[PDB]
């Protein structure tokens, strides 16, 4: 599903806001 990190903006480089800030922060 993901990649080998290269050239991957697609929704599945972790942007480490999708499922990380919209959980448990309000």
Same mark, same amino acid.
Request: charge should be positive; charged fraction near 25%; proline fraction near 7%.
């Given at each position: 599903?993901? $990649?080998? /990190?290269?050239?991957?903006? /697609?929704? $599945?480089v972790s942007y480490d806001e999708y #499922?990380? #800030?919209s959980v448990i922060k309000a």
């Open positions: 599903m993901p $990649g080998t /990190i290269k050239e991957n903006i /697609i929704f $599945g #499922r990380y #800030r």
